[PDB]
Amino acid sequence: MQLNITGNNVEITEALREFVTAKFAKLEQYFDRINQVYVVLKVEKVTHTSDATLHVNGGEIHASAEGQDMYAAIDGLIDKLARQLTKHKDKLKQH
């Protein structure tokens, strides 16, 4: 269960990185299919872009989200990502 992040054209402050990990953590409670995760967020005067990639036993999901800010990108990115994790998580726990 190891996760890492990479910021392109953005200063990675303990608070920022924490926010990202904070969301994933809350997901680590119900979601047990997370071993290696890599996230990247670009910050430009135009639009902010963020990408997420979660790993699962036998399968791997890769999605990306954009937001008005580095915070919004993570919100929608971790939102759609979670809902996706639950979908595939339903296949496993079949009882």
Q: Which domains, from first to last, does the chain contain? A: 1-95 (3.30.160.100)
Helix (H, G, I), strand (E, B) or coil at 22: helix
Closest CA relative to residue 6, chosen from 46, 52, 45: 52
| Alpha-carbon span 8 to 2, nearest angstrom | 20
Sign of CA dihedral 68, 16, 5, 76: negative
- Type of residue numbered 74: I
Pairing of strands 59-67, 2-8: unpaired
Experimentally determined by: NMR
Beta sheet of 36-43, edge-to-edge order: 2-8, 36-43, 48-56, 59-67
Burial of residue 65 (CB within 10 Å: 0-12, 13-18, 19+) is: buried
| CB-based contact 16:73 (threshold 8 Å) | no
| Alpha-carbon span 7 to 45, nearest angstrom | 15
